[PDB]
Amino acid sequence: GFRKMAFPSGKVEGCMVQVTCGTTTLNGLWLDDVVYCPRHVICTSEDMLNPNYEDLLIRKSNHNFLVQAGNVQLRVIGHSMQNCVLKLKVDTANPKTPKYKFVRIQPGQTFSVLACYNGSPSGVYQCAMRPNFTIKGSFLNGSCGSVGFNIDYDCVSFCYMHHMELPTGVHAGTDLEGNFYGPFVDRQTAQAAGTDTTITVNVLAWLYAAVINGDRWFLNRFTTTLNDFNLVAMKYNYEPLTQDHVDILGPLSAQTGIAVLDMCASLKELLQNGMNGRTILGSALLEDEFTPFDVVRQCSGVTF
Amino acid sequence: GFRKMAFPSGKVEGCMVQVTCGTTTLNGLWLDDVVYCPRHVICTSEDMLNPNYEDLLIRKSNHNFLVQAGNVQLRVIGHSMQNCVLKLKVDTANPKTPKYKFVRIQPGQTFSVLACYNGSPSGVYQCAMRPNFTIKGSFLNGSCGSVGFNIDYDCVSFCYMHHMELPTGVHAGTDLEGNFYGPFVDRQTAQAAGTDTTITVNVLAWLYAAVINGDRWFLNRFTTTLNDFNLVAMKYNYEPLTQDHVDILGPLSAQTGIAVLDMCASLKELLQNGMNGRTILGSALLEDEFTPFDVVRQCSGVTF
Numbered sequence: 039g040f041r042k043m044a045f046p047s048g049k050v051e052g053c054m055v056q057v058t059c060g061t062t063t064l065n066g067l068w069l070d071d072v073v074y075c076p077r078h079v080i081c082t083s084e085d086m087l088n089p090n091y092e093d094l095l096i097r098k099s100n101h102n103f104l105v106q107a108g109n110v111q112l113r114v115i116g117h118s119m120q121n122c123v124l125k126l127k128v129d130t131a132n133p134k135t136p137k138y139k140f141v142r143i144q145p146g147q148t149f150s151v152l153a154c155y156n157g158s159p160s161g162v163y164q165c166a167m168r169p170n171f172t173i174k175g176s177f178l179n180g181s182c183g184s185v186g187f188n189i190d191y192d193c194v195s196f197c198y199m200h201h202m203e204l205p206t207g208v209h210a211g212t213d214l215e216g217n218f219y220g221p222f223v224d225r226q227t228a229q230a231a232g233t234d235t236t237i238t239v240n241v242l243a244w245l246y247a248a249v250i251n252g253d254r255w256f257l258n259r260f261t262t263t264l265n266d267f268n269l270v271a272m273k274y275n276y277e278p279l280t281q282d283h284v285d286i287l288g289p290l291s292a293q294t295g296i297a298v299l300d301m302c303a304s305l306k307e308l309l310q311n312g313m314n315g316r317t318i319l320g321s322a323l324l325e326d327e328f329t330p331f332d333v334v335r336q337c338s339g340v341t342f
Numbered sequence: 343g344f345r346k347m348a349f350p351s352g353k354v355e356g357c358m359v360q361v362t363c364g365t366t367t368l369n370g371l372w373l374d375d376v377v378y379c380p381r382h383v384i385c386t387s388e389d390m391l392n393p394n395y396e397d398l399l400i401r402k403s404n405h406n407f408l409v410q411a412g413n414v415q416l417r418v419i420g421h422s423m424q425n426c427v428l429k430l431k432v433d434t435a436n437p438k439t440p441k442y443k444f445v446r447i448q449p450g451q452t453f454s455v456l457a458c459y460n461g462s463p464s465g466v467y468q469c470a471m472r473p474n475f476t477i478k479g480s481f482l483n484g485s486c487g488s489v490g491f492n493i494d495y496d497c498v499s500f501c502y503m504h505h506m507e508l509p510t511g512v513h514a515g516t517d518l519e520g521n522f523y524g525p526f527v528d529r530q531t532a533q534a535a536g537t538d539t540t541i542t543v544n545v546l547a548w549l550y551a552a553v554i555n556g557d558r559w560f561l562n563r564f565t566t567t568l569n570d571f572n573l574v575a576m577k578y579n580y581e582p583l584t585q586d587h588v589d590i591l592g593p594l595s596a597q598t599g600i601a602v603l604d605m606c607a608s609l610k611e612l613l614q615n616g617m618n619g620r621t622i623l624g625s626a627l628l629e630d631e632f633t634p635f636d637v638v639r640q641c642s643g644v645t646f
């Protein structure tokens with residue numbers, strides 16, 4: 039009775055276009071009269087270890103960018119770079135431009151990805167920005183320029199644009215101002231991601247979801263303190279829990295009548311003893327890609 | 343590198359409306375000049391054990407249906423029943439009507455759900471029609487009339503309309519011609535679902551996905567026969583595997599160079615021995631909600 043739900047994607051679908059530069063095709067985001075896409079579209083196979091993007095962009099003309107919005111070829115009238123994004127000024131404002139914002143999310147927050155190829159949507163899924171600023175995506179060749187987003191009320195908040203796959207098979211990209219999340223650079227080089235941790239406040243939200251949906255076996259009569267719990271968090275590579283995290287969990291704590299430090303004691307026992315061959319919300323692992331806000335939304339039926 | 347992906351929802355979003363009859367509000371599907379919704383919208387709390395829908399519908403007038411498409415109140419000019427769906431004829435054809443079909447899916451097939459409340463989309467997720475014709479949804483009060491769908495090329499195939507929650511907390515509903523999936527009736531009565539089984543051909547597709555994404559530990563040098571495997575399927579409540587299932591798995595078998603009866607031997611060992619505290623594609627259970635066609639799509643980047 040508790041699904042990993044993505045936002046409805048329609049408002050984003052009408053923004054996706056195909057961008058080709060030479061042999062390279064990827065996706066762009068068409069808002070008003072600008073198409074946003076990863077600047078690596080201007081690289082050739084010879085120059086991907088350490089591209090001088092300033093020099094490469096000077097070599098390019100508007101005519102070197104083929105932008106297709108379904109059937110419509112969409113004329114580029116100017117090109118500039120903002121950090122690691124290319125902004126292609128086009129002759130037509132997108133008539134399907136939604137109300138939007140560009141936001142830079144925090145590690146641990148969730149968003150929906152509209153995975154695209156050749157400017158065409160292929161599917162939508164929810165995921166988390168990992169504490170080490172990577173995402174565990176489903177992205178193939180041609181998926182670059184696919185975006186992540188949230189919706190609040192009538193407004194699309196774009197938070198992520200896809201650029202690359204790291205050696206470990208996880209994904210890296212930028213905000214819509216072209217700033218990478220994490221230490222990553224758009225050089226096709228071996229790049230270390232940090233140690234990743236589990237998003238504790240999300241695991242606790244997901245245990246609250248399980249209680250709301252009648253799944254209760256893991257509840258114990260014990261309580262803990264932030265200090266004592268964090269000693270166990272450190273041992274199992276869980277993020278430390280703060281009073282802000284307890285406060286954010288307040289609606290779920292009130293709804294269920296289970297204090298956050300009581301649920302922390304339950305999580306402690308799960309980390310120490312495992313699940314003894316049992317399941318929670320039809321999973322045999324502790325799930326960390328639901329924010330408290332995602333659980334409240336899905337348990338209260340919030341719409342857009 | 344392998345996510346449960348929903349279809350892009352935009353073409354469906356423009357079809358969702360709010361339907362109110364008395365105190366009851368749920369969702370409707372506005373295609374051309376017809377709004378489709380669950381006929382139980384016409385029930386009162388006194389008549390939900392065994393409604394005489396023919397008598398109840400005769401008592402209703404067009405004026406007893408309030409249909410809202412965002413702001414627009416949308417005038418009902420006729421009402422009829424097709425099996426367990428109400429068809430409300432409206433004075434305006436939906437200008438956002440997509441290319442569509444109504445299809446009745448098979449048990450074991452997947453589809454996306456656009457979960458709606460008050461005619462407004464809340465989120466989209468992928469799920470399977472269980473072998474016992476239930477769905478393991480995420481549906482709250484007010485979610486009735488939310489639909490399930492597939493997209494092939496440019497065409498929305500509607501396959502499911504949500505009606506009710508069964509005692510076990512799983513969900514039941516109809517095709518868009520109003521015929522229930524499974525033995526269920528629109529009476530708010532205790533109703534048995536069959537024994538459910540695991541969708542073997544989907545588990546094997548998902549093991550092929552794991553191999554494609556480098557997750558390989560469970561592969562063994564052994565092979566089996568359909569007969570010998572099915573003896574183990576029966577023991578663990580897995581659907582029996584047919585030569586049609588082997589043939590459908592052919593692209594995944596060819597891609598990976600692993601014969602279906604070789605993967606069957608791997609699945610046999612997983613059922614008999616469990617996962618020994620290991621994970622496949624970041625799961626500690628065998629996942630059965632990916633069809634062979636879903637894995638091929640997600641591994642080849644098919645778009646719409």
Ligand code: NA
Pocket residue numbers: 100101113114115
């Ligand atoms: Na041009």
Ligand code: NA
Pocket residue numbers: 404405417418419
């Ligand atoms: Na009317």
